[PDB]
Structure 1
């Protein structure tokens, strides 16, 4: 497995396992799962009431010092009853390390904004309002950031189609850029590309 297969880092795997045990037993009030992947990245799956007590911990504890908010992310998975999955990628420049902090919400539950911890989030969760409809309470200036001003809907939700519902054109009658319902000159062709054979037996799920 030398030339093609990626060389596994077992030292970082063991160290992230130990630090995941560390974070899991310092904060048992909110930490639900702790997992380390094959390419040695750590996820602390927590409760959405624990946005501030976890992220202020990792930013300020002397063994964590996760000073840089790299990436704040939402993931829409509609098969769950809390469909949206909020992801915090954190960087500790002191310990040369990266951690992930994951939690959940549905359309209606407000997630606690983390601008009192990381001001870097001031736009990102704003984007999560603009794209996913996840409301963030106690946000300073929460509004849209990436879509058009009169845009109705949250685009990156998976029940929202690829093309929207309205499209624009300039209209010479009213001398104005107007929105009609969307019509395509060619339909976006859907490619059913899933092979019917199980590619990975290691990720096999148990049946019902």
Structure 2
């Protein structure tokens, strides 16, 4: 794809998920789109980093692996295609010009409205040698939440792949042991998924109680 990545479609003015407190304002339809591919002249060293990545990777392989490049707020995010993640990770880590020796972790985020790409894993990579920073974004469907584990390339991803599996169910296949790290192994569900309820209890008060914030109204 080439259009910006719509993650949610909000209907109605005032950011109201429900029908609307006032009649007549619920007809606005605004898709919430995360930024799409950036025009080629990336700012700063991002342009050099992508030039080197496209040089080390073959043109065919580069096209197959890099789904998108997003330069947002002077930060570079390579939407990498799944499956190819280990290859590009190895290239980034090992290549002298890229040399992103320090992978800082793996963060899971869930986009239940993003069809075919509900689960995203974010790999913040830093190159101390060149003092550079990038992020890799890998998308997996909710129905097939598998992603190639970067354990061979970045051992630090262990306990980050485990944590993101625990909180989102992303199956980092190839991981030495993808067991729950935060939740009990007996736990049911993956808490940080949006569909997973907050699980709070009403706050008690003399003569009343306040339900958890997830049950009550909101205007996100």
CA distance in 1, matches of 2:185, 2:149: 23
Q: 2:70 aligns with which of 18, 35, 45?
A: 35
Q: How many angstroms does 1:184 deviate by?
A: 6.3
Counterpart residue number, 2:184:
148
Q: How many angstroms does 1:152 deviate by?
A: 0.6
1:128 aligns with 2:164: yes
1:16 aligns with 2:81: no
Q: 2:211 aligns with which of 166, 180, 187?
A: 187
Q: How many angstroms does 1:22 deviate by?
A: 3.6
Q: 2:114 aligns with which of 62, 72, 80?
A: 80
Contact 2:145/2:169 (<8 A) preserved: no
1:61 aligns with 2:127: no
Q: How many angstroms does 1:83 deviate by?
A: 0.2
Q: What is the TM-score with the length of structure 2 in the denominator?
A: 0.69
Contact 1:42/1:100 (<8 A) preserved: yes
In the alignment, structure 1 segments of 5+ residues that lack a partner are 1-11, 165-181, 195-208
In the alignment, structure 2 segments of 5+ residues that lack a partner are 1-41, 205-209
Contact 1:106/1:134 (<8 A) preserved: no
CA distance in 2, matches of 1:191, 1:183: 14
CA distance in 2, matches of 1:130, 1:141: 12
Q: CA RMSD in A?
A: 2.0
Identify the range of structure 1 (146-155 vs 90-99) with the bigger mean alpha-carbon deviation. Answer: 146-155
Pairing 1:95-110 to 2, within 5 Å after superposition: 95-107=130-142, 108-110=144-146
1:135–1:100 distance in 2 versus 1, CA, 3 Å: same
Q: How many angstroms does 1:99 deviate by?
A: 0.8
Q: How many angstroms does 1:17 deviate by?
A: 2.7
Q: How many angstroms does 1:20 deviate by?
A: 2.5
Q: What's the secondary structure of 1:14's corresponding residue? A: coil
* Greater RCO structure (CA 8 Å; 6+ sep): 2
Contact 2:53/2:91 (<8 A) preserved: no
CA distance in 1, matches of 2:203, 2:65: 48
Counterpart residue number, 1:115:
151
Identify the range of structure 1 (20-29 vs 65-74) with the bigger mean alpha-carbon deviation. Answer: 20-29
Q: What's the secondary structure of 2:87's corresponding residue? A: helix
Q: How many angstroms does 1:137 deviate by?
A: 1.1
Q: What's the secondary structure of 1:49's corresponding residue? A: coil
CA distance in 1, matches of 2:54, 2:140: 21
Q: Deviations over 1:50-78 (max 9, x none)?
A: 11001000000011100011121111011
